[PDB]
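Technical annex, item 7. During the second reporting period the consortium partners agreed on a shared format for inverse folding records so that results from different sites could be compared directly. Each record opens with the tokenized structure and is followed by the designed sequence. A conforming record, contributed by the partner at site C, is shown below for reference.
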């Protein structure tokens, strides 16, 4: 059984430990959506993580859903990300870019008046995050069949640009009710063409995006993110075990780097089903403590564990865990705010 502090190999890349930094949207890319020196220092100071998965990064204007979140479609953005990857590598870290398209989880304010796009014209519940004044999600536009290759081409170029920006790899964002998860689950995808109906058809787009990434990076440098509970952004599927199991089997057959599952452990968790179906490195996440995470590794339930909120507040989390030192508390007020306050001013032990 492995310790959290033992090395792990994902594909052909060795990680110094099994304490992973979860992808965290922080909205510090500013009006130009370009990564910058501040993000560089933020990531660099978390480089003692075995692996950093970057904040979700939009592969095209159409896949933007929040203010000041970065993209990976422009040459200006590539140069920005180069600052981040250079700084992370100088500090000894590894970093994967999370490739993102928000799909229906967006608003015309971010799309120059265009409707958000989706598998089917069905809006998610609640109100658009962060944007004031609060408003419901507008009903999205259902992608026409002949638009879907364009989405995949946007992901492919995203994966090309990540490679040009000097990342160690890319993670495909198939979770949290965003575009590929919308296609995946039958509450949001009600299509009757080849991208809807059956589990195979619903998983089709995700697998095409994964294959485009594999064409750019090879499978060894591609990860995928999933969230089986469907508990964010009005997700839900009639048979999660069947839907996600199929996806897990198909990704495992492609021998990708890892499968990252956001799913707190508990009575209804299907993570172990997904792990057996996948067969490769399995990263668990959500409400984990040091000890429950070590317990997961000891029981063969994960190969690595990711933390989000704790890495926000604790740049030196691995060493804090090592020493059983008190942890900083994260301040929700500055999760999405501008500038270095609540971003790079959380102190390391030193
Ligand atoms: C402020 C914030 C931003 C997040 N941004 C992303 C994101 O960009 N992409 C993603 O896949 N998950 C994102 N997440 C979810 C985290 O990656 C993680 O799965 C979740 O916080 C649960 O892990 P934790 O309990 O260790 O914090 C975000 C979470 C928070 C709190």
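Designed sequence (site C submission):
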């Amino acid at each position: 059984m492995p310790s959290l502090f033992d090395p792990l190999t994902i594909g052909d890349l060795t990680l110094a430990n099994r304490i992973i930094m979860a992808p965290l949207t922080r909205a510090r890319a500013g009006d130009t959506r370009t990564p910058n020196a501040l993000m560089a220092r933020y990531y660099a100071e978390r480089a003692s993580a075995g692996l950093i998965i970057s904040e979700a990064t939009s592969v095209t204007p159409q896949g933007v859903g929040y203010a000041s979140t970065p993209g990976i479609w422009s040459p200006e953005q590539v140069d920005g990300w180069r600052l981040v990857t250079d700084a992370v590598h100088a500090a000894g870290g590894r970093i994967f870019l999370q490739l993102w398209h928000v799909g229906r989880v967006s608003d015309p304010v971010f799309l120059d008046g265009a409707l958000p796009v989706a598998p089917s014209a069905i809006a998610p519940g609640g109100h658009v995050s962060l944007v004031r004044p609060q408003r419901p999600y507008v009903t999205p536009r259902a992608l026409e069949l002949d638009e879907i290759p364009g989405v995949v081409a946007a992901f492919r170029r995203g994966a090309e640009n990540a490679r040009a920006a000097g990342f160690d790899g890319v993670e495909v964002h198939g979770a949290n009710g965003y575009l590929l998860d919308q296609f995946l689950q039958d509450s949001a995808n009600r299509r009757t063409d080849a991208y809807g109906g059956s589990i195979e058809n619903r998983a089709r787009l995700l697998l095409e995006v994964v294959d485009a990434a594999i064409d750019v990076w090879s499978a060894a440098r591609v990860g995928v993110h999933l969230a089986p509970r469907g508990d964010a952004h009005t997700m839900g599927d009639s048979d999660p075990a069947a839907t996600f199991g199929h996806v897990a089997r198909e990704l495992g057959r492609r021998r990708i780097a890892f499968l990252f599952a956001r799913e707190s452990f508990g009575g209804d968790a299907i993570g172990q089903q997904l792990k057996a179906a996948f067969g490769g490195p399995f990263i668990v996440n959500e409400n984990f403590t040091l000890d429950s995470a070590q317990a997961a590794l000891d029981a063969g339930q994960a190969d690595a564990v990711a933390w989000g909120k704790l890495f926000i507040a604790n740049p030196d989390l691995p060493r804090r865990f090592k020493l059983n030192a008190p942890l900083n508390e994260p301040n929700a007020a500055t999760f999405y705010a501008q500038g270095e306050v609540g971003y790079t001013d959380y102190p390391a032990l030193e």
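The chain has eleven helices and twelve strands. Residues 1-350 form a domain with the TIM Barrel fold (CATH 3.20.20.70). All partners now use this format for quarterly exchanges.
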